[PDB]
Homo-oligomer: A and B are copies of this chain.
Amino acid sequence: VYLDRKLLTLEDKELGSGNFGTVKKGYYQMKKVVKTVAVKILKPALKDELLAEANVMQQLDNPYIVRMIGICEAESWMLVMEMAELGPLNKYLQQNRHVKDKNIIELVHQVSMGMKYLEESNFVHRDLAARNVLLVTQHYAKISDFGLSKALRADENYYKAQTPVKWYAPECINYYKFSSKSDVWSFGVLMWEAFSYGQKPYRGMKGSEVTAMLEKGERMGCPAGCPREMYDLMNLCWTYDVENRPGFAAVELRLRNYYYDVV
């Protein structure tokens, strides 16, 4: 899926930048119409990571996951994606404290539907966080940022690293083991972030202090205004033992049931 640079136009002003490179809004000429795109532009291991990121996204086909248009190799390496105009969820909620609880339920349920599909496809995200959810509209979220994602081997249900702690399940920190269950743990933190309107989890604590807090059986408190059933779901996501923690099928159905009971 190597795109033609002649069919891509990048805007001058960037949408954002960080240690990953830059993100610009762009336009890609397709069959007949022109498609608005977001382009991750690299500013080496980062090339291979971007290609691995593109390989994951091309295997994924779901309304709640950012769709890749292709890779473009010209002047710099570029990952061209369908544009989610409103950008990252945590920034959006920081700037829009008026969003209602039923709206946040809608969004995090959409994230659980995308992750239910990711789990069925036997991919692990490994970076599930509110910053990696992007808003198409105020009522349409998509999971983004597959740069750490891994396709599980056909014979294993976890990825084993050889060598963002506040989002990581205890078995990740201790055993370097990443599964769909550890994504569920990260999903609990994402939920906490979303109902906290984009505030950071475990405020003012270092990683080792978070680890020690969880070891004692302590968990973050219920965000102000968060429906009790949603806080109960977070705590289930933060089940310490992998086997008793739910998978995304159970999480999505709990969210689906609660959302329609509100609706």
What's the least CB distance linking A25 to chain B, in Å? 8
Report yes or no: A236 in contact with B11, Cβ–Cβ below 8 A: yes
Report yes or no: A35 in contact with B85, Cβ–Cβ below 8 A: no
Q: For chain A residues 15-42, which have a beta carbon within 8 Å of chain B?
A: 27, 29-30, 32-36
Interface: A75 (CB within 8 A) = no
Q: For chain A residues 227-250, which have a beta carbon within 8 Å of chain B?
A: 228, 232, 235-236, 240-241
User: B85, B235, B240: which contacts A9 (Cβ < 8 A)?
Assistant: B235
Expressed in whole angstroms, the Cα–Cα distance for A222 and B220 within the complex equals: 47
Interface: A155 (CB within 8 A) = no
Report yes or no: A218 in contact with B29, Cβ–Cβ below 8 A: no
Report yes or no: A35 in contact with B83, Cβ–Cβ below 8 A: no
Report yes or no: A29 in contact with B85, Cβ–Cβ below 8 A: no
Report yes or no: B33 in contact with A218, Cβ–Cβ below 8 A: yes
Residue of B nearest to A33 (CB): B218
Report yes or no: B36 in contact with A219, Cβ–Cβ below 8 A: yes
A residues sitting closer than 8 Å to B (CB atoms) are 9, 11, 27, 29-30, 32-36, 82-83, 85-86, 213, 217-222, 228, 232, 235-236, 240-241
Given contacts A9-B235, A33-B213, A85-B217, 10 further A-B contacts (CB under 8 A): A11-B236, A29-B222, A32-B221, A33-B218, A34-B219, A34-B221, A34-B235, A35-B217, A82-B217, A83-B217
